Amino acid sequence: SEVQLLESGGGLVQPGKSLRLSCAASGFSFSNYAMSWVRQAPGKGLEWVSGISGSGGSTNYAESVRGRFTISRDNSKNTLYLEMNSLRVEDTAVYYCAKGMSYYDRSGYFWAKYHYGMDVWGQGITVTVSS
Amino acid sequence: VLTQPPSASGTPGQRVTISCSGSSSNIGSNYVYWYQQIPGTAPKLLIYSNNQRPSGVPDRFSGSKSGTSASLAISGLRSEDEADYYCAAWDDSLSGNWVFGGGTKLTVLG
Amino acid sequence: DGVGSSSGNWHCDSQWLGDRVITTSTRTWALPTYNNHLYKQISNSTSGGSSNDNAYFGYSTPWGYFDFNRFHCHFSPRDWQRLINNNWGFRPKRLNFKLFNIQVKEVTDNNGVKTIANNLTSTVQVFTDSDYQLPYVLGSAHEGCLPPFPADVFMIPQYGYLTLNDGSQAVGRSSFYCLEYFPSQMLRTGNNFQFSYEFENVPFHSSYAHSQSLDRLMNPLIDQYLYYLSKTINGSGQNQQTLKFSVAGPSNMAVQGRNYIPGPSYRQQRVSTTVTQNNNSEFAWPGASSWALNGRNSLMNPGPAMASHKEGEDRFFPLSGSLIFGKQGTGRDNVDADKVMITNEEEIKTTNPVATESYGQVATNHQSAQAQAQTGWVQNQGILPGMVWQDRDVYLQGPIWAKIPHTDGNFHPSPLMGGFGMKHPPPQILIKNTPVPLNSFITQYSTGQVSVEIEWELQKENSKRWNPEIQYTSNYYKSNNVEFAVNTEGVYSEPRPIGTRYLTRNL
Amino acid sequence: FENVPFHSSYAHSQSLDRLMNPLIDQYLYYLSKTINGSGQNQQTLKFSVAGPSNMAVQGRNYIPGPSYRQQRVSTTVTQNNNSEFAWPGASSWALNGRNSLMNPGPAMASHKEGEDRFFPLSGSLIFVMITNEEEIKTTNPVATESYGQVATNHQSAQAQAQTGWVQNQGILPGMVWQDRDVYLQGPIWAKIPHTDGNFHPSPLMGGFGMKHPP
Amino acid sequence: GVGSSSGNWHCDSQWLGDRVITTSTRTWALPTYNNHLYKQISNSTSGGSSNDNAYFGYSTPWGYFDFNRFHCHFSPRDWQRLINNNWGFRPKRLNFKLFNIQVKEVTDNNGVKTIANNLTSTVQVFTDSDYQLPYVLGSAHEGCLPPFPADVFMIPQYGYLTLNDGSQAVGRSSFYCLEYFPSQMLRTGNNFQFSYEFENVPFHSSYAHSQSLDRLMNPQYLYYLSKTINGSGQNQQTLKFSVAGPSNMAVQGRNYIPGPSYRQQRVSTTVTQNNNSEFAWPGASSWALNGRNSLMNPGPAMASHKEGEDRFFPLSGSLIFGKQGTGRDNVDADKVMITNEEEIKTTNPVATESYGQVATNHQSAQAQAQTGWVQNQGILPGMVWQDRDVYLQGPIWAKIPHTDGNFHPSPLMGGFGMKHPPPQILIKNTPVPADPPTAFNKDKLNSFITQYSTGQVSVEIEWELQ
Lengths: 131, 110, 507, 214, 466
Fold this sequence. Notes:
With 131 residues, chain A is mainly beta. Chain A is built from 1 helix and 11 strands. In chain A, strand 4 and strand 5 form a beta hairpin. Strand 27 of chain C pairs antiparallel with strand 28 (405-406) of chain E. Chain C: It comes from Adeno-associated virus.
């Protein structure tokens, strides 16, 4: 298992409060893959919240999390960051850090169709939003 | 969303098929990925780009897509092949989203 | 010379000595008889003549030609990496073309079964046009070139041209050419053909990216001695107009005087990669930038060299702005995005305006007490004194040279798809099978070897840059294949376009 | 006489946009299809090979010369507008507050193929005998036409792709042009003005430019 | 040696034949910049978070000599002898000298400082003749040799900019260490010199035309269209052709047309005439590069105003010099000097005027002939134009950027475009460390002796006259 993704910043947060999640990537060239965050609610199926391009220029978000969440990455530090604002009880889930399998670069363009497929995941960090 | 049967059942050594129905925007015009997840563990990629599969994945797992529906077939079913299966594809509509299916829990009887 | 004596050897390699590179490429070819040894008129009337913009008139010929215009003909992925990483410039010097190992096979089909035997007395006519008397078809980036991979056997493309037309009709000024009317060289199974060509002096292609931008040339530590108007009014209110000037300095860098300004622009529509961000209508032709000639609209493809997108943007590309290559296996009509390869010309962003942006703003009125100052956007700007610009980049897949058209005058003859403009490019090489017996002939084809050699002159990298440069590298990770190699079925594919611009220079 | 380029006295047997081989495909692709079909949310990107079937989308190495548009005049008077537009509708350049008519101006095609009657207002020399530059159409734009189209905005889900016409177009890298044909009644040489700089000193009424003429 | 002079004082201008050999000499003072240290600089370091003003670059301890301005080598009398008797001029040769180097160390105790000589200390100087460093001498910067010979000038700090995204630096951005260049080291008895050959440039025209482009006629066999209608009424369409002659000189045929134009907004010196709103940046003509907007200052050479109008000047379309003692911010109109380009009007369009009119449609029985204004015009075949005039306070040369192509490389602020201009002359004081500790430490030495140097510079340029 050469590729390795770690998540930190998980915790218990009261509703309305905002917390920040981080993922440390190693074992691959980070800026050449588009990362994404997928959340799994307890006893529920996987749900894709947001993805970011390798350069960081373009980001996508699920409608449920749009405008409250913001995804960013620091290519120099090989980190994927997910900042969540105006949290609610509906957000309690286990958040995963998923790496985009397709590899691309500056010669080409970022294609959301092709580059969001995720070959490897992360252990995930449980996030709880309760009063 | 991508629709999947809640559960699927099989006997060891018997072929089992899991399928997801989708709209034109997702399954119809985009590649479909298959993820196998066992509870308490991060998901694993079984099939990507409709029928392709990653290294380190057994030959029995086969996936295909026709029209707006994609089917994942398992042959030589084993006890270790019992888990939840998630169907995923890119969705062009509603601003562009990666969509996961509802999930299917395959149970190996006997 | 003899039936059982080979007329040439196999030469493929690339020896690099000093400031020059010599590339040698040998292939195997097959030339069928085209049009059953007939010259035949062609026009859209045969295809129905649907559009006025698509109207054409011309002739198809029995002749065939050899084409090595694309860069990958002469360079391996390793030789191209060795070129683009180590050099600021290159350009072709000499050319040598050999044609040998001629074999003429006669196809004998008797009662449905077919047997192929040698015809030892057949000839293959070949000539080159060194006076540039025939139409020059080698500059349109056409298919049918030598294969990238040395073990591929390629089919020779059929030579045909076009002349003046009105609709599908001809006109009194139209020209017709019979290539039989040139002197040619005939070749039996032991004969061979060769010629040498001398490229005319051209400027070195600039395989580098600027490490500075045109608006940032100034020393950021010192204030300019020039002045700029900072305030037109003292404060909000009536009769507050005033003239106040401030020193142009590093705190405000947009107003400082500059000696030079970015190159010309002709805007392209920008298409977003995410399909839901695009307009829900068909705008590929309607929203396209185009130019008109003799009452016919032609798309401005690729057009003037401009930056594809602004820095920090990876999801947008000009509608007709950059060259698009198909991946191998890709279909002729309406293929998906993954099959194609859209090149990026973001290297030239520092000196050129973005293709999808306006050049700037101009005042369209005189400001006065009665009327407020007004500006409007420049969608296209021609050459101005003081402009500088970068030419479009050259690709491993893309074309090498073009023929500068023959006209009273031109400006910056460099071709718009990239490469070296020449008023005397390498001459076309025309080859055909001699008809062997009148409409009834013998089913016949020929094959052999083609070796080509080009001497390239290099411009070395003198840079004093302290930190390490960006280089084209092969990524290291496990995969089912290695890039730029064959797969399990014997198919040699090129996964991505390789630009020439990695090293940097000052502006 | 100082060295001058040979005046061209020939007409092209080809056009700038037809230089291609009609029998062969390009290896370049273009964007053929932006929508799968009719209906809401039918957005897609599809590419096709540029080739003999559709010749206007192919890549090209060169583009036609510059244009400064002249108003069109029909030899049949009834088709012309019933107003006085010789000066009011003239294409002109302004110098030091004075407006000078652009006569003849940049060399362009006097009329499109098949439209013998129409001619540019000030675009032709008139000896009356009105000369027409029909030969230059292959590499030059028509005098009475826009040079082409450019996009005026960024298309998006909210806004459609908008173009706008190019009435005048200066020199661009990659342009080629033909000068104005000399006539038997026309001038021979002209004196190039003495200035810091000039571009293509050839005189606009036809003939040879010279810095030190007779 | 210590007590011997390394050079003499040469200031004069000898006019012989078709050349003017000018020699200037000044006294300079070179401090220590950034404490002998390199520092990344960016807009974030200076704040302001303005996208158009974003920059990323480096500041170096080196100083540099700039003698680009015309006044360094010409006196007001030498400039009068030049412009009255000559049509044109251009530089030919260059001779630079740096001599009489004196190093001064400053010892400090509490609030009283003692300034003494250090004979051992040396100054590092080198020129870049391969043009491998970023070239800042063409940005019309301050720090040039003063116009008056008795003045003593301070040498400005060297700095350069590189690629950026915001205040951040992209991968392509480069870093140059000037210490990685071979240089010469001068003590109190050492001098430095080098010679330079100006590449061939055209003579800068120094005359105003006595004729105008459109009036070149003598007061033709060509005809023009005089009348499109016979008179008032319906169906009056007609075609009439009159002789082009001295009676109407506007419609005659012409071989050449004026140069290109990019319109500047017009600003009146009387404030009541100007609009009562802030239009300095909003109303300004500009050009966009990579999402950043740069003001089009000065831009294409054009006449500042129509003849007979003296109260109007283009907004950005001229060089504005300050009078002696003028402040750095928000100074009134009497504190500055605005240059004018009236002389070039004969061949050039006015900066505040449209280039002309073009046909935007086809006329017909149902459609009138329409025109539209050309607010910017590129080059056309047959254009002629004058470049911008050189001023006694203005720059001399600029470095033509190294690019695939350019047109008419002559710089927009005036002067001679050159691919290999006079080389940059870089100079710094060699850092002299203070006492190091007696126990070894691997960290670089941050403690230095406060130091500066002073000396003489003489530059000699040979000017050719037409």
